[PDB]
A paper describes a structure:
Repeated attempts to soak or co-crystallize the substrates M7P and ATP failed. However, soaking with the non-hydrolyzable substrate analog AMP-PNP showed clear density for this nucleotide. The ATP analog appears to form a network of interactions with the enzyme, with the majority of interactions formed with the phosphate, and the ribose O2 and O3 hydroxyls. The phosphates interact with the side chains of R13 and D163, while the ribose ring interacts with the side chains of S118 and S119. The structure of [name] bound to AMP-PNP suggests that the ATP may bind in a manner that blocks access to the sugar-phosphate binding site. Superimposing the locations of AMP-PNP and mannose shows that the location of these molecules is compatible. Indeed, the reactive atoms (O1 of mannose, Pγ of AMP-PNP) are located in positions compatible with the expected reaction (nucleophilic attack of O1 on the γ-phosphate). This suggests that the locations of these two substrate analogs in the structure are representative of the true ligands. Native [name] and an AMP-PNP complex had a lower proportion of the monoclinic fraction: for these complexes data did not process well and the model did not refine in the monoclinic space group.
Here, we present the structure of [name] from [name]. A critical step in the synthesis of heptoses is their 1-O phosphorylation, mediated by kinases such as HldE or [name]. We report that [name] operates through a sequential ordered Bi-Bi mechanism, loading the heptose first and then ATP. The protein forms a head-to-tail dimer, with the two active sites facing away from the dimer interface, in line with the native molecular weight predicted from size-exclusion chromatography.
Residue numbers in the entry:
A (entry chain A), B (entry chain A): 2 to 346
The structure:
């Protein structure tokens, strides 16, 4: 009787505030991020095995297989996230006795796409074990656990917003404090506002960013080394996230676009590689085609861009982007957080 | 006090049965179609004007402007659908007195994409007038009206499935009879089945089909001219749509894929240009990459293809398709039918 479980968690568009969730900034001044989940998913699958082994498979089809032993798996640099989730679950919920299983992942967008894929993948792996082991972990616990596994257990530097979008789902405004304290504010946005927003957003995939780690390091350095102007850009990122949140609650699209423009300027000034000449060319083309505001979705340097465009200019913008390197798509938001289902047993 | 209304209606994936909804077949034997709406939309906007004129704007940015006169607009071959919707509403709900307004449309996929864009656009224009005039038209009435406007008023040959997906939303199994009698069967599919299905579907945009009219004409000719083998292919299309419907209700994915394979064979045999060498090359590549079944979504000859692929082979299939001409995407279903909202007054 093999058991087969799948879980999924939606990826996310960073709307405002990204950068203020980097460790030194959040811990010192408090960070704010406004984000929203979209119709693209990370997935994890658990299949119990009929042989004494553990198998890990990743999105880019890396594979590791081990013999069933009663010591933690070493985090040797290959598939550390899968191993660390596995180690945590075995130690904390199965009294340290290994379980014969294959843990596999796949994702609707590769890492560096600006959709929060890395942390979303950690979240979905945890969710799959929550279903397999029937664990009483609520959304806060899963998001806090995903954070621990990635940033502490696997020692990976990064932000704090992606764990929460992946778990809770929908539009959320997050407040980040010291000692890993995060408050999630679910935003119940009016239906008309959501329809108007999707009607006015165009996404543009520019390719994989290879700048995220560098951007996060530079943003962290801003605070640690007291780079005054760059810190002030970050305070601007924080301020505009709150402005945007209130604009969405009031259905004030004029304020929404003005806060995105100021936010994008602030984000570019916070780190040298957030934008580059190639990204600025697209941005400028989008503006003269009729977009009113835009930004890179994730840390920066590539991945998805999003543009706000009035409906009368929408098709013009879509045609213009067709002439650049990348893929255009509409933007559809999802309300559901991470979900699991069973296929066998 | 200008009034601004927007409406949207979701586009659709043809899952099974397409072709049996062509006029001679449906009227003679009864047609069946299984389809489901996706996360891509057609839109219409109505703005009342402060000058005595009527303006029409289309998705590909064609524009017509007329003086406010008290006779129906001529269907001269430019923007006939917009004009005919306008004429109908003025004659039937405004006692024949013209209304000064701009009616504009735009769409997340161009015609020939295989997503039912043409009829979906007619539906959304009607919905916008339903909101502007506060009309008591339910979903059946809007779908029957969209059919009348396109196929009778504008004399355009085509199918019957798209008007119903655009209006009702979700997964529907439609039964088509003579005298324009259609029964919509909403399918309440289990959540796990829907998640499993989205996890197993990959979409692939091959470019605009220019075969739809020819395919529909050939399918119609099959019946009118008694082409025995080609009629029998169509009976197979019909049969497999019912099989697929029952497979989705039972969560039987083995039967689902077998009915899609038989359906695709039957569809190709119903009309010479449903597939071609270019489409078959993609299909074959998808199969050897691990897809278990696939098809062209609309009438055929191009547009979106969909593939069912087991989750363990999903990323392999995605990588393989990356090497062909077209765009890959995930498949996310929507439950909502056509919706309208107000921006001013
Ligand atoms: N200095 C660093 N060294 C090594 N890895 C890092 C460093 N900083 C961040 N990372 C990690 O690199 C991984 C890839 O992240 P990234 O390229 O941002 O793709 P993503 O997960 O799609 N998020 P984003 O694209 O920014 O929305 C994440 O797990 C980060 O935690
Ligand atoms: N013989 C014909 N002559 C002129 N127009 C036709 C004929 N047959 C069909 N049409 C119309 O051509 C238009 C374009 O349809 P089509 O290329 O199928 O794009 P679509 O609306 O995206 N549907 P599909 O792509 O098949 O899902 C529709 O309004 C049809 O009604
Ligand atoms: Cl972000
Ligand atoms: Cl952001
Ligand atoms: Cl179809
Ligand atoms: Cl079909
Ligand atoms: Mg990403
Ligand atoms: Mg189409």
């Amino acid at each position: 009787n093999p058991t087969i479980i799948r879980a999924r968690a939606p990826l996310r568009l960073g709307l405002a505030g990204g950068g203020t969730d980097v460790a030194p900034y959040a811990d010192t001044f408090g960070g704010y991020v406004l984000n929203a989940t979209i119709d693209r998913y990370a997935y994890a699958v658990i299949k119990t095995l009929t042989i004494p082994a553990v198998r890990f498979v990743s999105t880019d089809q890396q594979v590791e297989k081990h013999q069933l032993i009663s010591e933690p798996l070493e985090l040797n640099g290959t598939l550390n996230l899968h191993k660390a989730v596995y180690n945590h679950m075995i130690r904390n919920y199965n009294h340290g006795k290994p379980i014969a299983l294959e843990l596999s992942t796949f994702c609707d967008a590769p890492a560096g796409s600006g959709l929060g894929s890395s942390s979303t993948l950690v979240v979905v792996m945890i969710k799959a074990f929550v279903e397999l082991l029937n664990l009483p972990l609520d959304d806060y616990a899963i998001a806090q656990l995903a954070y621990r596994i990635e940033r502490v257990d696997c020692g990976l530097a990064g932000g704090r917003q992606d764990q929460y979008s992946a778990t809770f789902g929908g539009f959320n405004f997050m407040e980040f404090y010291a000692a890993a304290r995060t408050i999630v504010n679910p935003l119940r946005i009016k239906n008309w506002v959501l329809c108007e927003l999707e009607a006015s957003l165009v996404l543009f995939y520019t390719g994989v960013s290879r700048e995220s780690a560098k951007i996060i390091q530079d943003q962290s350095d801003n605070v640690v080394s007291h780079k005054t102007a760059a810190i002030e850009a970050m305070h601007g990122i924080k301020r505009e996230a709150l402005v945007m949140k209130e604009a969405l609650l009031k259905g004030d699209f004029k304020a929404f676009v003005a806060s995105m423009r100021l936010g994008w300027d602030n984000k570019k000034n916070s780190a040298r590689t957030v934008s580059n000449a190639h990204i600025d060319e697209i941005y400028d083309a989008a503006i003269r085609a009729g977009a009113q505001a835009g930004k890179v979705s994730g840390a920066g340097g590539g991945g998805f861009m999003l543009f706000f465009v009035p409906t009368e200019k929408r098709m013009d913008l879509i045609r213009t982007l067709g002439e650049y390197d990348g893929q255009v798509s509409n933007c559809h938001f999802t309300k559901n957080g991470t979900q699991a289902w069973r296929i066998a047993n």
